[PDB]
Symmetry: C5
Amino acid sequence: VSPPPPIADEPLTVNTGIYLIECYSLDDKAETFKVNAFLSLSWKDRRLAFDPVRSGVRVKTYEPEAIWIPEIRFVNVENARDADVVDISVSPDGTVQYLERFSARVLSPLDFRRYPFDSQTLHIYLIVRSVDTRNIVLAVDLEKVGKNDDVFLTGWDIESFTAVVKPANFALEDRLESKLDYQLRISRQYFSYIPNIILPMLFILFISWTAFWSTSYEANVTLVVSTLIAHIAFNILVETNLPKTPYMTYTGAIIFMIYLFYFVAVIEVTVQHYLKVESQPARAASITRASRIAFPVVFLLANIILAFLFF
Amino acid sequence: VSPPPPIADEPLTVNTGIYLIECYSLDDKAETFKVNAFLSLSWKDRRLAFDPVRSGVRVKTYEPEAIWIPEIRFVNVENARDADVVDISVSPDGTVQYLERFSARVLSPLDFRRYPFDSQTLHIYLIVRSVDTRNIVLAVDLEKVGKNDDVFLTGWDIESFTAVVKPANFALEDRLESKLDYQLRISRQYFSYIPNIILPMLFILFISWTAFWSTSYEANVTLVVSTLIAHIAFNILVETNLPKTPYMTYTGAIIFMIYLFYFVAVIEVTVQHYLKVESQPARAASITRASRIAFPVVFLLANIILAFLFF
Amino acid sequence: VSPPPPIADEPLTVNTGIYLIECYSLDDKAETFKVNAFLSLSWKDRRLAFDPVRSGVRVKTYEPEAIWIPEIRFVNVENARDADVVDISVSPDGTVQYLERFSARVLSPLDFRRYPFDSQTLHIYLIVRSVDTRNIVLAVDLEKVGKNDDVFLTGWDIESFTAVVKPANFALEDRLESKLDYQLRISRQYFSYIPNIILPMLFILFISWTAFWSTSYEANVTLVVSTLIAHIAFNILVETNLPKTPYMTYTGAIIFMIYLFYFVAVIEVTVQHYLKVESQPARAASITRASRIAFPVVFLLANIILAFLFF
Amino acid sequence: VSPPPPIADEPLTVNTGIYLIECYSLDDKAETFKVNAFLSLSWKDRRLAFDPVRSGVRVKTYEPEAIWIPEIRFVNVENARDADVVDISVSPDGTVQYLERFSARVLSPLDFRRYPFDSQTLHIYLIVRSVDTRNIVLAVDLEKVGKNDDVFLTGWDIESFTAVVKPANFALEDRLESKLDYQLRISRQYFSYIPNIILPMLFILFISWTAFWSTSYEANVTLVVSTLIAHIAFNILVETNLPKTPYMTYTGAIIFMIYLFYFVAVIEVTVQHYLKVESQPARAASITRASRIAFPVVFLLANIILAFLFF
Amino acid sequence: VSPPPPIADEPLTVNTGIYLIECYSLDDKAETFKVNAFLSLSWKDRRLAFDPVRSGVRVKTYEPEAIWIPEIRFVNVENARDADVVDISVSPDGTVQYLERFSARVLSPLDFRRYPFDSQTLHIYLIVRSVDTRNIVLAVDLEKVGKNDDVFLTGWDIESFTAVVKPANFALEDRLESKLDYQLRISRQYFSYIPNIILPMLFILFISWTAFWSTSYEANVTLVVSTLIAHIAFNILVETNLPKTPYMTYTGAIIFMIYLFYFVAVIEVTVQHYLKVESQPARAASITRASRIAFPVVFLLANIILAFLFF
């Protein structure tokens, strides 16, 4: 079926909007998330006009393959959306309300530069293939959008759903400049991560720093080295939660800092024993007493510095 | 084929019900479970009337694509159900018994806030696309439903299969207000988890608390630190069973409590040694004797508190 | 094409049988196994009669979509079998030999209650959709069945392939009572598991029990606790082989027994040291000497008890 | 289209051969490998005869669905090969050169009985569904076969590509006796495995055997037990490379031998300490001095025995 | 539709080029990467000629199935590209601009011989099935190619996108000699890997080398052996990042070097203790003092040698 005849040169603006249902599988490995939402389409077609008691039906349902519908295709998806038409209701006023449920594997980059405390911005791109006249998809309904009333994707906090049509193209064709952009700026709630990940590493590190309140070399070595083994094992346990992160993560900088602190603690214990064995107890005691206060303070300063360079 | 002519304005109520077969893969990662069950559909069509010895067939089987069938589609699924028609039997009374086997990837949130002892509630949503008259799917058969006689999904206990039609919609269309809801409230049997997960952590913790019956510093450090390593390794072993759980789990609060107890035990051992080395054996003995009773009691109180805040 | 005209009221019995080819992927996670076997179908149709030197062809191959074939569908599968017709040979006697290769994802519960020594029973269900007359699929060929001559699924031992038609239904329809059941009772060969899993845990446990031939407290603590860490690490190594097993496994009861034995060994070492430090060497020596014999004997008794309650 | 008329009773032999492209994913879990190769088919059809300057085209390309092509189907595959016709060139001589690219998930048993040094033999089976006359697929081209010039599947060494037509059938039909077998005997290069797996276990074992050059019981226990923990951790690290291997592997027999050696080393250390504590230093020294030479020699003998029973 | 009539014997050269969109999943296990890019096709067809104010449309969009398009198929892919036509614009000049979005699972070997610092070269192959006249696909647009402006695949650095048509074939057909090759030479940025992987292993190794500043045998054994356990655990942690790598990796040669260094350190500690116990303190002190400087120097030399043989 040919597109409805344009009465004038006015572009056939289509009213569009996605009502989110289930945003799940937010990281298959680290990147894709899947959506199973509805999208509502409204436009103007030369369908039934005002109908005062002639046919008796207001929402005249039509076959999905009968009436022409604009071709709207997602840009950043694995494959074409699994479109399943739910209800095509055409009103006598002259507008067609199209509602289809699709399950697309949306693509969006995940920026884990501040992993425990990050706030990502998922993206959905819309393009319309113009046939005879230019179609402007910039018409955002702003009334058929929104997630579920539960307001949680998979344990995430939604902040906004700004939909701005950016007059930009991927250096191709002519109608690509009219892209419709869906910005879902979600924020991760971090309460669970504080005891799940952050606190136990600090507890293990403090168990390590205990080694400065001991004059026994064997006990000090056991503390520091076995605590290093415990920290590596806990890192293995945590690593299941963390994504690939090929670049430098924030939580990948605290862990390296903790490794450096283990190395410095081993060096300090060795220096203490080395000075204590060769008839210099005063220097060993001075170094131990200095380190008792110097290690936590330097750790606090390092954490503050990392927070400043990352936030 | 057009829908059968409604004799009056009575909505074409369809009798529906799912007879579960195999509820498996209850957590692909943590969320979806797959079903391979049958669903039975019964309605009223202008098919063959009473047939006293004329055709000789009562269950007149018809082609799946011949007779019109109502469009019933699952809401919370990955894709359209893999419907496979088994038997369309139309009775001379005027009712069509439709039975199709489908394998849908049903979506349902899993609430692991009390993981070992939880009781989830899986969901299945039903909607009917009305064509000419409103279709009410609220007609639940209540006789063609139920799981297998084995009564086990994958090691779960079934409690009820309440099917309540909630007059609610997802703020879209007109017929979405007639949603049919299938509540399968399943409960997890916890006998295996007590020795699989809970008991060994307590055994490791008691091995740690042994360190209060020793006056040797090297032995105490070995006990506590190597027991911490053992606990982290056992946590890694357990973590395969546990799902993602981005929020605060109950079993994720006992583990953090155990980490805190390891930290406090290390602090206590250090305090004992620190006081014992500098000519204060009385204070060290007093602290050790107090801790012997104070650690298990505080652990019991903490477990009771966690149970109260979680249950 | 309509089914061949029944000469009388005799049900159209179809001769069926599956010749297994490759039973692989026996546990995708713990439950499904995939089959890529052939199934042979023989029935009676009003095809070419006796043909003495008229056409000259005995096995008159026909198009898969030309001649009607009975609808046989698997019950416990993910989706419809990937049927691929290989050869439809119709004999002048009046029988059609149908042979199709299918790759279905068969569903079958796996009962790991005696995991190392278990003997499962895989299942395949057959149903026929009757059209005009009742079709009885109880006709098992008993000559076109059997696995490969290699006699191994994926490292399993086949015992029987009993095919009993159970006059039972899933409380639905009328022809479901004629289900055809394929019981493949396979047994797992356990020789590899004895050194892969069972023996190393016993070796680690004996290394632990060594601690009763030592009067050194630090050495005893090192033995028992580091051996507990080694046992947990070996449990992690084993856990890859083991399936989910949400219920109480046999091999999940030996492991818990070993954990309990580690706890009791720690308690015994602590009691020995506690009595030895406070001027009671006689009691410590008596307890150690008793434990030397009492631990292996109690372990043997516990293993015998577990074997009796599990086998 | 009917098959070309056979001029005589000569079977329509088809020239076939696979030119391998990318043999990858050699173990999805342990068994299947995927192929994305081309297969060349040549036969004799009643197509255009000798064409001296009449049409002017030698390789007269035809539509894939226009000219009849023999039905060649893979036996040991997940599903039907993803056949994609590339070029059907028919020569005036009377032969059709058919070339299609397929991506089949070939099935082949992997025999890891000598894992580091094994030499598998992948298999591909060919069958032709005869229609009017018997088709013999035994015609192997022997000129359109071969892997890539790189000569590497995924880090494997190719030795031969023998293609022998075995007159055997799977006890079914009549034309199954003409199966075409493709034997790709590949060999695994083992240089990387010697430092990746074999050498570090030997280094850890030698670190264990160090314990016989020490008279300290605590140091001996630390060495042997912590080395056992290190060996188990390294076994966990290796296990990712190794496949399931439900049966007795060669590399699964060296590991068990190493576990037995750890147990015997613990027993020897205990015996040394037991004799040394009760006023028998001569016997302890004799046992230690004997063990120093007796452990490596027995290990060498055990390795030789395992090599003989496995190779 | 037949191909447009060639005016002369000039081959129908097609202008082609891929504009990359999302190069993700660069290692499903170790080898494949997926693309979801557009490809632009331009050729010459006998379509509408110069059109001065007759039809009024310049980019006359045509149906994807209406106008003939050349058959361009990817060679090294899992299956046929998921082609989705976006816009077929034919200009009055006589050229057709074809633009389709495809999501192909491109195959390309990954060469991890210098893993942390490598620079791979992904490949895409193009072939055209000639019908009547030879089609030369060597026409590279060089203006419709390029990745996203972000210039990052999944944390990779792009260096060039050279597109050279290599007159080579896979020893098959006649038109295979005209293959079009897309070389995307990407380089991996290594900043994150230095603290993620390389630095912690060096820290653990230095903790091991600490053992040469101690005269205590128990402390030395604890250091070296527990540090070996820590290194193996960290190797397990790293191994998730690393691919299969069946051959000899660079980062798989530093790790083996570190294992050898642990073995040599254990031997040195044993030699020190062995000489110290039997009244040779001078030799033990000399060996310790020599090793203090000899271990880091030999490690530096070994790293330089490995860098030279690998780079």
